[PDB]
Amino acid sequence: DLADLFPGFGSEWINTSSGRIFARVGGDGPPLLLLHGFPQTHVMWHRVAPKLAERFKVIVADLPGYGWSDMPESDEQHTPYTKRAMAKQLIEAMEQLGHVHFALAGHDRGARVSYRLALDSPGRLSKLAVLDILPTYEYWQRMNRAYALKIYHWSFLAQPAPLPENLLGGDPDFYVKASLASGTRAGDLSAFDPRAVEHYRIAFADPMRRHVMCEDYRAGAYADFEHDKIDVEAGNKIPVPMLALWGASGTPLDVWRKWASDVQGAPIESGAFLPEEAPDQTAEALVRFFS
Amino acid sequence: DLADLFPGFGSEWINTSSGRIFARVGGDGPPLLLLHGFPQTHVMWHRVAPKLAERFKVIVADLPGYGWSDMPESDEQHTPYTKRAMAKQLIEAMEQLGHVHFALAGHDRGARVSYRLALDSPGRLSKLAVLDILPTYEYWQRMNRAYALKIYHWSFLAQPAPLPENLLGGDPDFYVKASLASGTRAGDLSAFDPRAVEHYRIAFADPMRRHVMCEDYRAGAYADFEHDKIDVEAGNKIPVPMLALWGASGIAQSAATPLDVWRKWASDVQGAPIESGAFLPEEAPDQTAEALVRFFSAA
Ligand SMILES: *[C@H](Cc1ccc(C(F)(F)F)cc1)C(=O)O
Numbered sequence: 001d002l003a004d005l006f007p008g009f010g011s012e013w014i015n016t017s018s019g020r021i022f023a024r025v026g027g028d029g030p031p032l033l034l035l036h037g038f039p040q041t042h043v044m045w046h047r048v049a050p051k052l053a054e055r056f057k058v059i060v061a062d063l064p065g066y067g068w069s070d071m072p073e074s075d076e077q078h079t080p081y082t083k084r085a086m087a088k089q090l091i092e093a094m095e096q097l098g099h100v101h102f103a104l105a106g107h108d109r110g111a112r113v114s115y116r117l118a119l120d121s122p123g124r125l126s127k128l129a130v131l132d133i134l135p136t137y138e139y140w141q142r143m144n145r146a147y148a149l150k151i152y153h154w155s156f157l158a159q160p161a162p163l164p165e166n167l168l169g170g171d172p173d174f175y176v177k178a179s180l181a182s183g184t185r186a187g188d189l190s191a192f193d194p195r196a197v198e199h200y201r202i203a204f205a206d207p208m209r210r211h212v213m214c215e216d217y218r219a220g221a222y223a224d225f226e227h228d229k230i231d232v233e234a235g236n237k238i239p240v241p242m243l244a245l246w247g248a249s250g251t252p253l254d255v256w257r258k259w260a261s262d263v264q265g266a267p268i269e270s271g272a273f274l275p276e277e278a279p280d281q282t283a284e285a286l287v288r289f290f291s
Numbered sequence: 292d293l294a295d296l297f298p299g300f301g302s303e304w305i306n307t308s309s310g311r312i313f314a315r316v317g318g319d320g321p322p323l324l325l326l327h328g329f330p331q332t333h334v335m336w337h338r339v340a341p342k343l344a345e346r347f348k349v350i351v352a353d354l355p356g357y358g359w360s361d362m363p364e365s366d367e368q369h370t371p372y373t374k375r376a377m378a379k380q381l382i383e384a385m386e387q388l389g390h391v392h393f394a395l396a397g398h399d400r401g402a403r404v405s406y407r408l409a410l411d412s413p414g415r416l417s418k419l420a421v422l423d424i425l426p427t428y429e430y431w432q433r434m435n436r437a438y439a440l441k442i443y444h445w446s447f448l449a450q451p452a453p454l455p456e457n458l459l460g461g462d463p464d465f466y467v468k469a470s471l472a473s474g475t476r477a478g479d480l481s482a483f484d485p486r487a488v489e490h491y492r493i494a495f496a497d498p499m500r501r502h503v504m505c506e507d508y509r510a511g512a513y514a515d516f517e518h519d520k521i522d523v524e525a526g527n528k529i530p531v532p533m534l535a536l537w538g539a540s541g542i543a544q545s546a547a548t549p550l551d552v553w554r555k556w557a558s559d560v561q562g563a564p565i566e567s568g569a570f571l572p573e574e575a576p577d578q579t580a581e582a583l584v585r586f587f588s589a590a
């Protein structure tokens with residue numbers, strides 16, 4: 001049995017035109033959507049969501065194709081796993097709950113969905129927080145030897161199918177665990193709750209889920225990059241008030257200032273898994289910003 | 292069984308301070324060392340070595356850690372699999388045969404051993420040919436989005452052990468065959484002799500051999516890059532007459548005019564493309580052999 005790490009929260013399967021979105025839902029007050037990244041699921045918010053739920057209705061969603069959300073059929077341009085499409089699908093999900101204007105925080109891939117959502121449909125967001133990321137365009141522009149070695153996933157997982165799928169299927173438990181440990185300050189799994197790690201391992205064990213992650217990275221190399229490049233070339237900035245947080249061992253505020261007209265930010269001592277490695281600091285920063 | 296693809300050639304298993312070098316040896320005349328790359332072994336010269344042996348004493352060697360050569364234990368700096376160390380080791384092997392001044396042609400990793408040998412110990416070489424490559428420094432300096440997506444293997448295989456080893460171990464035949472096919476002009480295995488593919492597959496089947504390949508790419512990301520960086524920043528050029536040959540659909544040309552790049556690294560360089568992917572001596576054996584015979588035979 002996978003553990004229930006959100007005591008008090010409901011479990012909802014929310015319909016959209018592209019498939020169901022699974023979410024844990026707790027609290028009352030203004031609506032706040034939380035979006036996880038790779039290689040994780042909604043459970044990564046389990047240490048910060050309760051504190052947010054003291055003041056907000058918190059909706060903790062599995063991204064399209066991740067976790068227990070349905071996996072829409074992809075295509076040659078990876079369309080359903082582009083951040084523009086995932087944002088449209090999560091906008092539909094929020095409309096099923098009657099939420100057309102909400103607060104949003106995302107981490108890693110979910111943060112990519114979130115800033116794309118803010119660029120495409122800023123009217124949907126009261127405030128936005130992004131965790132542990134720079135825009136996809138900035139990672140690719142920075143691409144050099146040092147980055148190619150650090151963020152090798154961006155080129156490896158984007159290789160044409162079935163290359164990464166075939167490699168990942170030999171020992172997916174090792175890969176997911178080694179990858180998680182490698183992004184933390186500690187270099188091991190000690191910053192994660194073992195019950196959460198089990199959620200991540202079980203999702204990663206499904207070849208269909210791993211294919212989705214590769215489609216996500218293929219979109220990140222191609223259409224998501226092109227979408228971002230258009231905004232850079234147009235001089236488009238996010239007008240939604242926003243917060244950028246990042247683990248120092250994972251400036252970023254200088255970068256976000258080029259992408260957003262009202263942005264505040266701060267490093268926190270942590271690797272790339274802020275809500276699990278530094279939950280108190282992360283929750284405090286998010287509560288203060290969204291309140 | 293593994294086929295003899297150099298019918299009539301002898302063999303040597305040559306001791307050095309870092310372990311044995313296996314080679315096939317044929318012909319007579321001036322000495323010519325041939326060095327293969329990844330994910331191959333000495334057998335990739337089988338369609339050209341017999342032609343070269345009409346004119347030269349040909350030594351077709353497995354790189355340190357590859358094929359039937361011994362695998363020295365590596366270290367945190369990947370030292371024995373750096374091109375500097377491999378070149379020192381192959382200099383020792385050649386001296387065991389009485390060759391202290393010789394001609395050298397390398398392909399892929401073997402071409403990287405070769406130009407590093409030329410930079411560190413130019414007196415060892417009469418002439419040098421590099422096939423299918425740019426210097427390691429130039430590959431890394433050209434890193435951007437397009438290049439990173441095109442040649443992902445450098446950064447993937449250089450990840451800390453045991454991550455690439457663990458990924459490659461689940462289905463190693465799939466990876467080596469897909470990799471080989473991916474480099475050829477047509478994208479399939481048709482360019483290769485199936486007996487040669489079986490040599491490559493059997494080598495790749497051994498986890499210790501795959502570990503060496505990762506160590507070779509870890510050196511390629513770190514010390515090899517640093518060694519090259521020192522030379523290009525110092526303006527050190529190879530003085531040995533050299534030939535650069537590359538497949539037009541191969542790796543070196545991906546985002547470069549290779550001869551222009553080599554002219555930065557070498558004071559006496561000529562070269563040409565050949566219609567081929569990245570496995571010139573198998574995909575275009577007659578043209579490769581002719582180019583090498585003509586270059587090494589000229590004065
Ligand atoms: C997520 C970046 C990313 C990729 C891989 C890891 C880890 F540690 F698991 F290997 C962490 C973070 C993104 O692409 O947004």
Ligand SMILES: *[C@H](Cc1ccc(C(F)(F)F)cc1)C(=O)O
Pocket residue numbers: 328329330398399400403424444469470471472473474475542569
């Ligand atoms: C060799 C470059 C290289 C890498 C991969 C392949 C292939 F086709 F097998 F995938 C060919 C050549 C080097 O690093 O020198």
